[PDB]
Design a protein around this nucleic acid. Structure first.
Ligand SMILES: [Zn+2]
Length: 273
DNA sequence: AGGTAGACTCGGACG
DNA sequence: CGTCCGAGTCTACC
C-alpha cells in the first residue's frame, strides 16, 4: 500500500472504530510491535483508551487515542477489518484490539512485515518513524522547489530519489513508475541530470497521479482492498506498472521491465527519455 | 565517497 | 522448483 491505498483504508476504517473503548489487546506475532518493544507494555497502556480519530502521514496510519497515538505501517500485505468477538479469526491475524461493545479491530498480514509504534501524542511526530518523513505530496509543502533541492545534490537514479520517503512521503513502486512515464522521464536517469522543466513536469504528474488514485480508491493489482473488502479501480488507469510486454497505451511500443534501484521497474522506452 | 543489486523480514500464487 | 510481490533496512560490492 502507498498513499492512495492507505488513505482509502483510513476513510473506510474510521467510522467503524471512532468512539470505541479498548478493553483488551492480543498479540500473536510480537515482532510487529516495535515500541514499546515489550509487547506486554504495548498492550497494557492501550487498555481503557478510546479511539478519538484516525489520520494518515505518508504511508502510515495514525490512530489517535486518549494519551497515546498508535502508528501503524502495513508494508506489503497488512490490512485491517472490524468484526465480532464471537466469530473465529481469519488466517494470518496477528494483532487484535477488543472493544467494550463486543467488536474487534483485527490486523492481518500474511508476510508479517508490518510495524506498530505507540507514543504519547505529543511525542509521535518527533520520534521515529514519523520524524524524518518528507512533505505530504497533496499539500503546499510539496513544490517543484522542494523536489529540485534534493535532486540537484545526488546522482542516484530518479526512481531511487522518489522512493525515498524523506524526500516526499507516499510514493512506492506503482506510483513512482507511473509518475515518471506521465512526465516522460526514464527511471534510471540520475536525479541531478533533470532540468528545471523536467522537475516541474514531474511534480505536476506526481500530484495528479496520486490525487487521481485517491479518488479511485487505490490500485488493486494483487491483494489490496479497502476496509469493506472492495477493490480499488486505479489499476485500470495504469500506463506501465505490470504491463511489461503489452503495447504502450500512448505509442504502442512494448512496455519494458528491468532493474532500477535494485527493483523491478516498468517503462516505455519511446515515451520516456 | 557515493552509488546499486539484491539478501532478508515472511508466505503464498503462479509458470 | 524457481520467480514474483503496493515496503523498508541493511550488507556486499564497485
Ligand atoms: Zn509509449
Amino acid at each position: 500500500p502507498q498513499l492512495p491505498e492507505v488513505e482509502t483504508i483510513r476513510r473506510t476504517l474510521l467510522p467503524l472504530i471512532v468512539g470505541k473503548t479498548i478493553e483488551d489487546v492480543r498479540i500473536f506475532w510480537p515482532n510487529i510491535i516495535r515500541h514499546p518493544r515489550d509487547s506486554e507494555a504495548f498492550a497494557a497502556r492501550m487498555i481503557g483508551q478510546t479511539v478519538r480519530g484516525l489520520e494518515r502521514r505518508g504511508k502510515f496510519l495514525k490512530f489517535l487515542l486518549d494519551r497515546d497515538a498508535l502508528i501503524s505501517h502495513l508494508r506489503m500485505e497488512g490490512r485491517y477489518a472490524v468484526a465480532s468477538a464471537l466469530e473465529p479469526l481469519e488466517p494470518h491475524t496477528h494483532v487484535v484490539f477488543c472493544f467494550t461493545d463486543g467488536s474487534e479491530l483485527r490486523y492481518r498480514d500474511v508476510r508479517k512485515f508490518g510495524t506498530m509504534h505507540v507514543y504519547a501524542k505529543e511525542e509521535a511526530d518527533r520520534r521515529p518513524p514519523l520524524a524524518e518523513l518528507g512533505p505530504e505530496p497533496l499539500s503546499p509543502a510539496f513544490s517543484p522547489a522542494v523536489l529540485a533541492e534534493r535532486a540537484v545534490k545526488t546522482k542516484r537514479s530518479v526512481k531511487a530519489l522518489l522512493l525515498d520517503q524523506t524526500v516526499v512521503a507516499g510514493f512506492g513502486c506503482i506510483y513512482v513508475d507511473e509518475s515518471l512515464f506521465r512526465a516522460g522521464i526514464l527511471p534510471g536517469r540520475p536525479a541531478a541530470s533533470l532540468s528545471s522543466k523536467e522537475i516541474e513536469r514531474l511534480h505536476e504528474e506526481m500530484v495528479a497521479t496520486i490525487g487521481e488514485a485517491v479518488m479511485k480508491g487505490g490500485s488493486t493489482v494483487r491483494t489490496y482492498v479497502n476496509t469493506q473488502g472492495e477493490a480499488g479501480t486505479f489499476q485500470h488507469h495504469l500506463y506501465v506498472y505490470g504491463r511489461q510486454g503489452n503495447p504502450c497505451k500512448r505509442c504502442g511500443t512494448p512496455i519494458e521491465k528491468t532493474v532500477v534501484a535494485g527493483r523491478g521497474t516498468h517503462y516505455c522506452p519511446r515515451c520516456q527519455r
